Design a protein around this ligand. Structure first.
Ligand SMILES: [Ca+2]
Ligand SMILES: [Ca+2]
Ligand SMILES: [Cl-]
Ligand SMILES: [Cl-]
Ligand SMILES: [Cl-]
Ligand SMILES: [Cl-]
Ligand SMILES: [Cl-]
Ligand SMILES: [Cl-]
Ligand SMILES: [Cl-]
Lengths: 181, 183
C-alpha cells in the first residue's frame, strides 16, 4: 500500500469506524470520482477537494433528500466540496458501525437550517415535509409538527434542542398510514 | 326518494358516521357491488347479510393495505372479516378524511393488538413495525425501534403499550435517521 503512510492510515482508523482495508476501499472510491484531480499518493498531504457535483451524484447520496446539506455539513468549508478527510468522516457517520446517537447528532445538524442549535417549528416543518416525500398532506405535516413539539419540547420554548431530538422515537414508522382510504 | 333504506335508517347512518345521506347511498352501492346476488337492494326489512372476507380484502381500497385482514376482522361483526353493511360503513367512516386522528389511533390500537388482549406487547409491536417497514428497516433495525418505543412509551413499565400509551405517541412522525442509513 503506497497511498498513505502508517501514521496517517492509523489516524484514519483512530477517527473513523473503518478498518484499514475499508479506508483503502473508500479512498479508491473517492479517487475514482475525479481520477485526474485526486492524486494517488497522499503521503505529501495534498490539499484536494472533489466538487459537490460529484459527491451529490454518488449512488449513496443520489436519492437522499438532504444530500446537499449532508455534503455541506461534512465539507471542510461548508460548500459541499469534499476533501478525502471529509469524505471518510461522512461515510464513517453513515456507516452501519456508527451509533444511533452519533447519527442523531448529525441529523440534528442538517435539520437545523439556520444553524442556531435548535430545530424550530419552521425547521421541523421543512424537515418533515422533505422526509415524507408527499406521503403526508400539508395539513397532516402540520399536525405532526404540532404533536412532536407538544411531546418533545422539553424547555417549552417552541423548538427542539439536540437533547429533545435525541430523546425522540426518531425511526418509528407512521402507524396511522393504514387508516386512510 | 331512494328505495334501499327507510327514512329512519338513513337518518341513523348519517347520525352514527361522518357521512352525508348521499354519501351513505354511494357507499351502499359500493358494498352491494361486491356481491350483487348476495346483497339485496331492499334493506328496509333489516336483512342479515355478510360479504365474505375474500371480497372485502380484494377491494381496490384495501387490497394494497398490509393490515387489510386485521382491519376487516376488527370491523366485522364476529371478528372473522365477513362484513355486514353496518360494519362496512363503520370501517369507511373511521378511514375517511373526516375521522379525527384520535379515532384512527383508537382503531389502529385494535388492529395492531393481534391477540385482542387490549395491550400491544413486544410481539405485537414487532409484527406491526416489521409489516410497516418491509424493505426499509432490517430485522435488527426493527428490533431497536421496538426496544425504544417500549422504553419511551410504556407508561406502566409492564412491557406493554396501553391505549393511553399508544394515543400519546408521535404515531406519524417520519424516520428522521433514514438520511444517515444507506440503502
Ligand atoms: Ca434552527
Ligand atoms: Ca396484544
Ligand atoms: Cl484493521
Ligand atoms: Cl440528480
Ligand atoms: Cl440508528
Ligand atoms: Cl345529504
Ligand atoms: Cl355524493
Ligand atoms: Cl401485502
Ligand atoms: Cl391521522
Amino acid at each position: 500500500q503506497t497511498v498513505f503512510t502508517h501514521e496517517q492510515l492509523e489516524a484514519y482508523q483512530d477517527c473513523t469506524f473503518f478498518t484499514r482495508k475499508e479506508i483503502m476501499r473508500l479512498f479508491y472510491r473517492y479517487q475514482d470520482l475525479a481520477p485526474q484531480l485526486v492524486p494517488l499518493d497522499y503521503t505529501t498531504c495534498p490539499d484536494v477537494k472533489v466538487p459537490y457535483e460529484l459527491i451529490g451524484s454518488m449512488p449513496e447520496l443520489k436519492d437522499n433528500p438532504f444530500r446537499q446539506r449532508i455534503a455541506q455539513v461534512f465539507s471542510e468549508d461548508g460548500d459541499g466540496h469534499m476533501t478525502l478527510d471529509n469524505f471518510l468522516d461522512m461515510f464513517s457517520v453513515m456507516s452501519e458501525m456508527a451509533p444511533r446517537d452519533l447519527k442523531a447528532y448529525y441529523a440534528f445538524k442538517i435539520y437545523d437550517f439556520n444553524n442556531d442549535d435548535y430545530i424550530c417549528a419552521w425547521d421541523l416543518e421543512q424537515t418533515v415535509t422533505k422526509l415524507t416525500r408527499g406521503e403526508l398532506s400539508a395539513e397532516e405535516v402540520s399536525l405532526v409538527c404540532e404533536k412532536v413539539l407538544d411531546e418533545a419540547d422539553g424547555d417549552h420554548d417552541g423548538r427542539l434542542s439536540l437533547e429533545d431530538f435525541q430523546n425522540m422515537i426518531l425511526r418509528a414508522p407512521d402507524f396511522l398510514s393504514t387508516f386512510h382510504i
